Structure formats: C-alpha cells, structure tokens
A = this chain, B = another copy of it.
C-alpha cells in the first residue's frame, strides 16, 4: 500500500535524448529513427519578433550540431513543422522505442524527463492544467525536454518544453509542434489565463485515500449531480459530468462508496475545510491524479 506521485520509468526516453546546437544556442532534441525533433527556437538568438520561415531558409544542414553522448550525428535534411524543427540524420537511433505522438487533454497527467545539454537530470509527474500550463521544474537549458506516458512498452509522447510564463509555470507543444494553449514561441507579455480545479481528479484521490485507510472525511449523505455542481462553481471547481461518474465507476465499486456519496464528502470539505487533519499526507485537496493514476497504484 501507500500512494505516491509516481513517474513512468524513463529509460526508453533517456535513450532518445540528444543535444542540438545552432550557433550559440544549445537545447535538447528527441531522436527517433533517423529524425531529431527539437524546438524551432534553436535557430534564433535574442535579437530575433521573428519570422522563422526566413530564419530557416538562411540555415544549412552543417549549421546544426547534433550530439548523442559523444557521437556526433550528421544532419542531412531540415524542415519545420509548426513550432518544432525536424532534423534528418544519417543514423537511425538503435534505441528507438515503439512510440506514438499523442496530444493530451487538460486534466490528464504525464511524466517529464528534465534534460540539460542532451543529458537527462530527473523525472517527475505533471498534469496539464485547464489553462494549458504545467507546473514543472525547468532551468535554463531545459528547452526540448519531453513529456510522455508509457503503455505496454509503447511511449506516447505528448509534450515538448518551450518556455516559462511570468508566474513561473510552463508552456509547450505537442510533438507536432502545436502549442498547448494560447501561447507563442516569441517574447510577448503572454500570461497564464485563469485556472480551475480538476474535480474528477480530486474525487479519484479521495478514493485513493479510502483505499489507503483515510476515512475521516466520509459521511452518510449523498447529493445530486446538479446540487454538487452548484457548489463546484462556487469554489472554482470544474463541473462534474456523467462521463466523470462513469469513469470513477471501478473505484466506486472497489470501495463501495457511490460517486455521489463521495461528492457529498467533497462538498463538506470545500465548505468546512479539514479542521487540522490531512488526507494522504496533504492539508490541501489534490487534483493532479487521474482515475487511471489511482487505479495504477490501488490494485490492492
């Protein structure tokens, strides 16, 4: 037992991380088969309101230094797809895993492999916030670090890191180079929009707590979906849908606590607080675990 925020084992992604250098700019790239994917930001400096089409036309293959550990990888083609650069290299990565490029939804989680100069440094879990930012840990040089999920040895890549917003949260793209949220890879006054709490995840985590022996917040009451959603709106929680209730079915069955029964507990927690008590070691309600994340750790 126990419940911990847990990343996927990162080995399959570690074998894909390379360093990409163009001029005086270095960042990370992702080497799959004979293509390296990285942020197109690598082709400009600080002086470049940039036109990336013009900037790339003025580059040649030999302007791109790609290093996989010690071995230099010869660039033989270059192109741009939205905000990512694709560098064709003369060697297929022999450690390419089975993989997919997937775009994830707000409220879903993924593992981030933080990398610097093509060298992985740490791994942690992130949720895509409703406002399309993530609360990561990225220092200078982390551009091109990727986010992923792993399912039966298939790596589903969903995130490439591009920048940090003024509040210290983080924005990036899918692996097709399309930004999550209303952000751009140039210097503007862009800021994170208003955020909300992911209700279905909070309920999943309350189920995790019950499975792990925390029961003090339970009560004999049930509530209707409509009356719960009135309370949710008051506290800046997302509305709960019938599909959310359906998704929580397996956890509800395992614990014998109907979803709308648990909603009555969440309503009381929102209105009264915790009164000095904690849930799974937290004094706040946690919304960064999906129902899948809980079921993954609460099989027993």
Contact = CB atoms under 8 A, between A and B. Distances in A.
Contacts of A113: 9
A284 interface: yes
A21 B34 CA distance: 40
A135 B284 contact: no
B114 A6 contact: yes
B168 A138 contact: no
Contacts of A284: 278, 281-283
A272 interface: no
Interface stretch (A25-33, A118-126, A180-188): A118-126
A131 to B, nearest CB: 16
Chain A interface SS verdict (over half): loop
Interface string A2-13: 111111111110
A6 B7 CA distance: 9
A1 B122 contact: no
A50 interface: no
B297 A124 contact: no
Contact of A9 (B1, B14, B164, B170): B14
A8 B282 CA distance: 24
Contacts of A9: 10-11, 14, 113, 120-123
A229 interface: no
Nearest to A297: B137
A8 B283 contact: no
B168 A1 contact: yes
A5 B2 contact: no
Contact of A283 (B5, B137, B283): B283
A194 interface: no
Interface of A: 1-12, 14-15, 113-114, 120-124, 135-140, 164, 168-170, 212-213, 278, 281-284, 296-297, 299-300
